[PDB]
Amino acid sequence: GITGTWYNQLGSTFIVTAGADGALTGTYESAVGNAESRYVLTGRYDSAPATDGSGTALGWTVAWKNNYRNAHSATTWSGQYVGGAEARINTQWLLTSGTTEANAWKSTLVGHDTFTKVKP
Amino acid sequence: EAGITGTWYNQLGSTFIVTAGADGALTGTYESAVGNAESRYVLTGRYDSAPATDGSGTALGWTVAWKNNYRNAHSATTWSGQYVGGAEARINTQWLLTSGTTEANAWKSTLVGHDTFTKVK
Amino acid sequence: EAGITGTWYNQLGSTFIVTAGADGALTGTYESAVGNAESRYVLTGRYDSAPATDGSGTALGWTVAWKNNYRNAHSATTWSGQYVGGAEARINTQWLLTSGTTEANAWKSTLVGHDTFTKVK
Amino acid sequence: GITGTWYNQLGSTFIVTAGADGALTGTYESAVGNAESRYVLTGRYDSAPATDGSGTALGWTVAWKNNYRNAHSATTWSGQYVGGAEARINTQWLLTSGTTEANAWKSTLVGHDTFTKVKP
Ligand SMILES: O=C(O)CCCC[C@@H]1SC[C@@H]2NC(=O)N[C@@H]21
Ligand SMILES: O=C(O)CCCC[C@@H]1SC[C@@H]2NC(=O)N[C@@H]21
Numbered sequence: 331g332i333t334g335t336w337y338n339q340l341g342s343t344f345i346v347t348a349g350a351d352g353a354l355t356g357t358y359e360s361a362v363g364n365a366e367s368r369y370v371l372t373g374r375y376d377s378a379p380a381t382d383g384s385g386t387a388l389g390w391t392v393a394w395k396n397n398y399r400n401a402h403s404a405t406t407w408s409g410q411y412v413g414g415a416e417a418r419i420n421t422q423w424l425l426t427s428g429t430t431e432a433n434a435w436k437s438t439l440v441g442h443d444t445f446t447k448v449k450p
Numbered sequence: 451e452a453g454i455t456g457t458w459y460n461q462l463g464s465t466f467i468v469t470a471g472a473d474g475a476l477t478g479t480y481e482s483a484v485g486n487a488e489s490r491y492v493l494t495g496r497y498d499s500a501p502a503t504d505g506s507g508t509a510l511g512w513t514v515a516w517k518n519n520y521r522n523a524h525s526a527t528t529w530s531g532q533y534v535g536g537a538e539a540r541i542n543t544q545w546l547l548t549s550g551t552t553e554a555n556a557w558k559s560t561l562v563g564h565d566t567f568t569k570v571k
Numbered sequence: 572e573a574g575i576t577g578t579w580y581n582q583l584g585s586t587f588i589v590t591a592g593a594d595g596a597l598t599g600t601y602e603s604a605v606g607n608a609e610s611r612y613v614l615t616g617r618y619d620s621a622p623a624t625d626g627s628g629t630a631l632g633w634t635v636a637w638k639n640n641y642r643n644a645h646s647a648t649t650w651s652g653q654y655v656g657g658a659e660a661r662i663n664t665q666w667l668l669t670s671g672t673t674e675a676n677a678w679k680s681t682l683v684g685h686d687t688f689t690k691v692k
Numbered sequence: 693g694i695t696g697t698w699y700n701q702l703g704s705t706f707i708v709t710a711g712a713d714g715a716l717t718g719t720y721e722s723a724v725g726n727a728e729s730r731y732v733l734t735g736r737y738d739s740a741p742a743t744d745g746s747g748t749a750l751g752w753t754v755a756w757k758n759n760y761r762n763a764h765s766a767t768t769w770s771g772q773y774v775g776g777a778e779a780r781i782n783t784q785w786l787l788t789s790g791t792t793e794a795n796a797w798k799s800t801l802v803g804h805d806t807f808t809k810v811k812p
């Protein structure tokens with residue numbers, strides 16, 4: 331299932347609980363960037379996916395402020411969970427930093443992360 | 451926080467009602483004017499609760515999974531952006547809408563776009 | 572084609588000069604108002620030369636590599652979007668700006684945004 | 693170098709020539725979507741990359757019209773070439789379909805393709 335401890339290709343750790351009615355709640359620890367230790371995350375997932383082989387849509391957010399650091403930024407991940415022997419969460423993400431209006435054009439990074447439950 | 455909290459409408463005519471908590475939480479409901487959607491959907495997200503004071507926006511994001519007690523689109527949108535405060539407050543965003551797909555169709559699972567929200571009263 | 576061909580300016584104040592060829596080619600120059608850029612840069616792209624006639628936009632895209640004979644930013648932007656014709660013609664786009672990075676920094680190589688171009692005369 | 697025949701994770705074939713001063717010219721054949729046979733592509737790349745280990749920035753466009761089909765759409769790929777024993781081109785892409793104004797919100801797909809010169 332979605333609940334568990336996940337790792338992406340960068341070595342970041344995503345610990346999440348999927349509530350029965352669609353909540354995602356957990357913590358995120360990034361291996362890269364202006365980040366240290368765990369950050370709060372919240373999100374949502376489709377708690378009644380299609381029964382045709384399709385993945386389960388989901389998304390979550392981290393604001394990059396915790397007791398250690400504040401990067402004045404937030405990332406959202408949007409993607410789908412694909413169950414099976416080697417379960418996967420495939421995502422695309424948007425990292426927005428707070429900027430002035432004149433620099434808003436360069437406020438948002440985009441990328442893609444794939445998660446599995448295999449520990450580095 | 452008082453800044454973010456409130457009712458907002460985007461260029462499509464969608465409605466965003468949000469509460470910003472002291473801990474960095476965003477909670478509320480979203481009603482989309484378009485797509486496979488009807489009525490209100492739960493949203494949850496996070497914002498920078500101690501932002502820069504140097505004329506920068508406040509970073510934030512939130513998610514809606516497009517399932518409520520009336521419809522299920524088997525999809526989820528995330529919005530990533532910044533709140534720009536002041537008397538004409540704005541939330542400027544980019545978003546990713548992922549649909550659940552089969553593996554063969556995963557290449558076409560995700561739409562991208564941008565929404566600008568205006569605060570109402 | 573006559574529609575796309577011309578001079579266009581975006582919300583940043585950047586300048587796009589383009590010629591649309593009968594074969595679907597776009598050629599021209601781009602001058603950015605912002606970033607690690609000065610003067611004009613070559614652009615090349617493609618457009619749908621036989622678009623739908625049913626009130627839909629004309630799909631198109633183009634690339635600028637941010638090297639000219641005056642500066643090199645070691646980066647490239649692609650714009651993907653549609654031309655909306657008529658007396659107030661627009662090109663509405665989303666873009667991806669990739670910088671060359673080391674492998675360890677590749678996760679932060681790409682910016683995303685959106686530009687709207689207005690045709691001038 | 694960039695010039696050559698490349699394949700992505702979907703099995704699409706990208707045949708390209710990198711001109712000395714920054715042009716990319718070639719053809720693209722997609723394994724998926726509303727597409728058959730080869731399509732014209734053009735793009736640009738950094739013809740004098742940094743000498744610090746960094747990749748070479750590049751991008752290209754395909755409009756999905758050829759003598760067989762017209763999907764009334766265009767894709768742009770933005771990314772970097774990474775040389776070495778197993779050269780790679782890592783990209784993110786935007787696929788815009790012509791739409792009415794009211795449907796423009798759903799006009800643009802986003803994804804990511806990785807290319808190598810290894811034939812399936
Ligand atoms: O530098 C920052 O502003 C905060 C840390 C951002 C790290 C990002 S989020 C997207 C990507 N996936 C990760 O696991 N880490 C980076
Ligand atoms: O069609 C779906 O799968 C569900 C509805 C998605 C509607 C989206 S979310 C991004 C954009 N902004 C809105 O206010 N509505 C659309």
Ligand SMILES: O=C(O)CCCC[C@@H]1SC[C@@H]2NC(=O)N[C@@H]21
Pocket residue numbers: 435581583585602603604605606607608637644645646647648666668670684686
């Ligand atoms: O800073 C760079 O690496 C080169 C200049 C990039 C400027 C970009 S491209 C997308 C956006 N639209 C513009 O008109 N300018 C910026």
Ligand SMILES: O=C(O)CCCC[C@@H]1SC[C@@H]2NC(=O)N[C@@H]21
Pocket residue numbers: 557700702704721722723724725726727756763765766767785787803805
């Ligand atoms: O369906 C269409 O509108 C035309 C074909 C699009 C296929 C795309 S482009 C991005 C992705 N990478 C590929 O190799 N194929 C798909």
